Design a protein around this ligand. Structure first.
Ligand SMILES: NC(=O)C1=CN([C@@H]2O[C@H](COP(=O)(O)OP(=O)(O)OC[C@H]3O[C@@H](n4cnc5c(N)ncnc54)[C@H](OP(=O)(O)O)[C@@H]3O)[C@@H](O)[C@H]2O)C=CC1
Ligand SMILES: *P(=O)(O)OCC(C)(C)[C@@H](O)C(=O)NCCC(=O)NCCSC(C)=O
Lengths: 262, 711, 82
């Protein structure tokens, strides 16, 4: 009924990076993807620019998975109720997301992480730091195939607490890199697909503006995972109490052949 | 070589014959000329069932109730898997029992058919081998006949039941009857006497009166002299309940087909309502049941298929989640549990607790038993008969074997050496061993912990309760080998030696000096002989249980520039066959390109695709439980609109040839969890105009799909 | 006199949840006598222990909460002494 979004997954579309996010060969729409769609829809309803709007989503259920069609086009029909804030992303007669989105003009951020300037991960040895190669070896072994646009975390501690998330302008990818601090906070071997983010605040007025066009040395925003409150915060974003559902692992190749050298 | 060994020397006789044949590979073994060849192991053998003393029921594919099989139980090692993390905080005293009958509840069916993931269960069961079965009835270690509840898996042949959860079977019930009592009546007392606080003369409303928990709830309430209202599906259930409990008239029965009971219960109680509501139905029946509550009434909701809003309530502490409380109590076994233990124990003596109806299913009919519970076409308990009860009342359990599928397990009291295990496949293999039982690892390297990824996982293991010792020692001298095993016997008996070391130097054979040649020959020859020698001498020889030597396909496929690595890798493959001649344990995986971990991790070499590590460990589990020495494992790389969508839909299910499989076999029969169905559902719209329901997906054949796209 | 400065928090902002959870070593509070509304009510419920009890005696309940009382979803304890 309200704003209909067309995700163009073509060769040179600006949203071609959305294909660099797959789970064992399944190219799914990011769980934080629906957060941006709902966030942008509220701004369009209000008439303000989505980057000047401070939102707060509550109880964001990812009801069902959206399989992006490579080299094609997918349509969603985001719908936000004017005063209550009930938002809903849907495709035809199938529900894909739900929750409540609210805007405000005051402080929406609980943790005081939007004030941190540099990075605690300075001067530490190489054996007390994780780098981009090693962080995404942990994710890959669990089935999360991240590409180059979703590989935001540049550094971290062995505790997974402190990070060096990268800010490069794209919002669907940045909100995912903040949700990766949650995934690497629960070491394991199974594959979990997030299905409920209880609270998300994206106050952009305390968040660095979009990089000047043509930039290549994108800056890094310090982030932190709060094991007490279960809050993943980095810059002007927080995700609190995100739950996931285990999923069986799919073999992308064909079954191996076992022989007996005799 | 036989009594007449060949005499191949220049102008010899046996040699001249070889030259005439002119064969590129001549090996004299077992007294005959031949060739080393890789013979394909059929795919049917990976699931071949062999006799095993201790077995337990699990699922091959999660969410499929037709994939339940019997696997080997680590209880052959005495202990049980999942002794990591929280499970190490409760030092419960346990009694090892031999299970004779295993009870089947709706909790097991819910987990088996994918309605709930194992992560909803108590955190102490996160690393358990399986999550199926809680109640049982068998014989303890002393021969006494016992029954009780234990953390899963109780659907096995041996359990380690806490001594505070074990009742004694009265000398009137057969072991078959005792298998129905524990959980049904333990939950009835929890719902009524522990959570509902029932009082004498109170009015209680019980949903699904014919269910096993429903029947138990009625018996407890009647003992409390309550006014009972129950929901019965059909007249057969109503008649059955009346026969079991003569105190029930036709006035105490309603219908679960519609929410018309509300007026009946609200008129017969004169508007006071019902004091306790044991709720299993959902939707509008849940709302109507709440509205019947008295002013002090309690609502106990034990349904499993909760909605989304009420699932949020559980997360945000709005409501208490009581559908997995018996499981949680059994982990802690604290004051709350002992109250239920006393209540049920009292009930047995006072005659309230009486065996329910039963339906015995053999072990091999586990799949049929699970389907019977799920359908709920008839009332009664479903119990799997594991053994046959002896005529005596106190006698030892005869030692017998059951057919089961392989499952590698490692002794928790034995130390395992992982030479070169701090890298690539070693760290993700040590993780596998920890999950499967290993709790004592000695990882060895030339330098030590030198990267942040290593330090993170070594810290992860130590957190889980594993004792990891990292030695920076290369075993290239008998002195070093003694030191490594000295640090091993000080942790525990040495029960495994894995060599996953590699030092590659790649160059054309002609351009390699002596030093450069023997670089990959230290971790594959010099080591493997020093580790082999130690395993051949006591005390390791008696204790040693696994001896694994990882190798590569260069032994059977060859490669260019890696003449040295080929030489060493083959000698490792022959040192692991001398061990077989002498009867010692030995295993030598012969891998191909592998993904996600190591050398390849940093694609297609010799046309062979890299394997996913979660498969490397699936076949590796097969490799350890096998009789052969070397098992080669590698992966090789691979119209009308009606056939277009069929291929895509078949590809989702994991079928390579859609035409090969039967056209009359439903999708659920092959296996369609919860994500394959949505992918098909969105694909039948993306590819064609069809729009189908998710539930319709699992009950539709390939022929139906073909006949539907044409329409 | 028994109470010390450690036993007090501030009602102005929802920073007590962090402090209480840290001071209780993650076990949570066994009983909550709740009068505040909105984000303070949710935060108080999240401090509840596994057995913890939530007693809500506030009078100015929200419309959704009031419907819960009518539906028998929750008990209404604000006029129970009466
Ligand atoms: N990776 C693959 O795709 C394939 C693997 N394999 C086999 O599987 C294993 C792969 O392990 P991978 O981690 O991938 O190889 P890597 O090169 O990734 O790391 C191997 C480890 O070997 C250790 N190592 C080497 N020499 C010694 C030594 N003398 N003493 C102690 N430790 C030593 C190194 O530790 P440090 O660096 O600290 O000395 C290194 O961490 C090897 O055994 C290999 O033969 C078989 C076929 C292909
Ligand atoms: P059935 O038990 O009904 O299955 C429910 C499923 C299909 C799992 C549904 O809840 C679902 O698909 N949820 C996942 C939503 C999702 O993909 N979120 C994360 C985006 S992908 C990522 C982490 O890579």
């Amino acid at each position: 009924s309200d704003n209909v979004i067309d995700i163009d997954l073509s060769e040179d579309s600006p949203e071609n990076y959305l294909l660099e996010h797959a789970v064992d060969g399944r190219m799914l729409f990011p769980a934080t993807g629906t957060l941006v769609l709902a966030w942008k829809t509220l701004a369009k309803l209000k008439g303000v620019e989505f980057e000047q709007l401070g939102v707060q989503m509550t109880n964001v259920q990812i009801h069902q998975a959206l399989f992006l069609n490579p080299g094609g086009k997918t349509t969603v029909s985001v719908s936000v109720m004017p005063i209550t804030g009930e938002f809903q992303v849907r495709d035809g007669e199938s529900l894909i997301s739900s929750g409540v989105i609210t805007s405000s003009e005051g402080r929406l951020l609980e943790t005081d992480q939007h004030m941190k300037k540099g990075s605690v991960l300075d001067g530490k040895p190489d054996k007390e730091l994780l780098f981009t190669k090693e962080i995404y070896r942990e994710f890959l072994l669990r089935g999360y195939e991240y590409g180059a646009a979703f590989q935001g975390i540049q550094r971290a501690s062995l505790d997974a607490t402190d990070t060096d998330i990268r800010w490069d302008g794209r919002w669907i990818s940045y909100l995912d890199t903040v949700l990766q601090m949650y995934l690497l906070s629960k070491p394991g071997t199974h594959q979990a697909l997030p299905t409920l983010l209880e609270s998300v605040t994206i106050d952009p007025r305390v968040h660095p503006a979009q990089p000047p066009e043509g930039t290549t040395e994108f800056q890094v925003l310090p982030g932190k995972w709060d094991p007490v409150l279960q809050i993943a915060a980095a810059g002007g974003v927080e995700i609190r109490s995100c739950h996931s559902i285990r999923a069986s692992r799919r073999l992308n190749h064909d079954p191996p052949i076992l022989e007996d050298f005799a | 070589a036989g009594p007449n060994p060949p005499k191949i020397s220049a102008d010899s006789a046996d040699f001249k014959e070889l030259v005439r044949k002119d064969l590129a590979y001549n090996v004299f073994k077992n007294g005959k000329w031949g060739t080393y060849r890789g013979f394909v192991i059929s795919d049917a053998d990976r699931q071949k069932e062999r006799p095993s003393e201790y077995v337990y029921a699990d699922w091959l594919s999660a969410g499929d109730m037709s994939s339940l099989r019997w696997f080997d139980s680590p209880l052959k090692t005495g202990h049980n898997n999942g002794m990591l993390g929280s499970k190490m905080a409760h030092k419960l005293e346990t009694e090892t029992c031999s299970v004779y009958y295993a009870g089947l509840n709706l909790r097991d069916i819910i987990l088996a058919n994918g309605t709930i993931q194992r992560d909803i269960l108590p955190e102490e069961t996160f690393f358990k081998e399986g999550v199926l079965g809680v109640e049982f009835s068998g014989r303890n270690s002393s021969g006494k006949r016992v029954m009780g509840l234990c953390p899963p898996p109780a659907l096995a042949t041996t359990v380690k039941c806490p001594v505070s959860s074990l009742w004694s079977v009265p000398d009137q019930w057969t072991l078959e009857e005792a298998a129905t009592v524990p959980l049904a009546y333990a939950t009835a007392y929890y719902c009524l006497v522990s959570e509902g606080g029932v009082q004498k003369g109170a009015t209680v409303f019980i949903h699904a009166g014919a269910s096993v928990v429903g029947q138990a709830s009625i018996a407890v309430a009647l003992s409390y002299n309550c006014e009972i209202f129950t929901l019965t599906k059909n007249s057969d259930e109503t008649a059955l309940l009346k026969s079991m409990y003569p105190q029930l008239n036709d006035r105490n029965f309603c219908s679960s087909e519609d929410c018309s009971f509300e007026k009946y219960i609200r008129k017969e109680t004169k508007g006071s309502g019902v004091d306790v509501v044991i709720n299993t139905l959902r939707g509008k029946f849940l709302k109507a049941s709440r509205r019947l509550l008295s002013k002090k009434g309690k609502f106990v909701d034990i349904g499993f298929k909760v909605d989304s809003n009420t699932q949020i309530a559980y997360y945000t502490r709005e409501h208490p989640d009581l559908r997995f409380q018996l499981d949680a109590l059994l982990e802690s076994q604290g004051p709350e549990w002992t109250r239920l233990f006393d209540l049920v124990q009292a009930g047995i003596h006072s005659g309230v607790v009486k065996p329910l109806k039963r339906a015995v299913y053999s072990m091999d009919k586990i799949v049929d038993a699970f389907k019977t519970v799920e359908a709920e076409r008839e009332a009664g308990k479903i119990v799997i008969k594991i053994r046959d009860e002896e005529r005596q009342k106190v006698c030892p359990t005869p030692r017998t074997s059951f057919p089961a599928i392989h499952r590698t397990c490692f002794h928790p009291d034995k130390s395992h050496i992982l030479v070169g295990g701090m890298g690539g496949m070693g760290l993700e293999t040590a993780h596998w061993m920890v999950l499967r039982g290993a709790k004592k690892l000695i990882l060895t390297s030339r330098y030590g912990i030198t990267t942040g990824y290593q330090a993170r996982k070594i810290a992860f293991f130590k957190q889980l309760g594993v004792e990891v010792e990292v030695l920076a020692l290369s075993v290239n001298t008998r002195k070093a080998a003694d030191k490594v095993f000295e640090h091993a016997l000080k942790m525990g008996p040495v029960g495994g030696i894995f060599n996953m070391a590699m030092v590659l130097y790649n160059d054309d054979f002609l351009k390699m000096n002596r030093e450069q040649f023997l670089k990959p020959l230290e971790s594959k020859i010099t080591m493997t002989m020093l580790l082999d020698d130690k395993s051949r001498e006591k005390p390791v020889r008696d204790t040693l249980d696994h001896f694994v030597m990882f190798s590569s396909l260069i032994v059977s496929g060859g490669h260019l520039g890696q003449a040295n690595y080929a030489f060493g890798s083959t000698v490792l493959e022959k040192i692991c066959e001398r061990r077989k001649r002498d009867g010692l344990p030995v295993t030598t995986p012969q891998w191909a390109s592998i993904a996600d971990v190591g050398t390849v991790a940093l694609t297609i070499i010799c046309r062979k695709y890299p394997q996913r590590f979660f498969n490397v460990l699936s076949v590796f589990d097969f490799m350890m439980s096998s009789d052969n020495v070397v098992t080669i494992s590698y992966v090789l790389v691979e119209e009308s609109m009606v056939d277009q969508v069929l291929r895509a839909v078949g590809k989702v299910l994991g079928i390579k040839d859609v035409s090969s499989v039967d056209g009359d076999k439903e999708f659920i029969d092959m296996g369609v969890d919860s994500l394959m169905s949505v992918e098909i559902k969105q694909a039948l719209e993306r590819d064609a105009g069809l729009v189908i329901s998710t539930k319709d997906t699992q009950l539709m054949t390939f022929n139906t799909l073909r006949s539907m796209v044409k329409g």
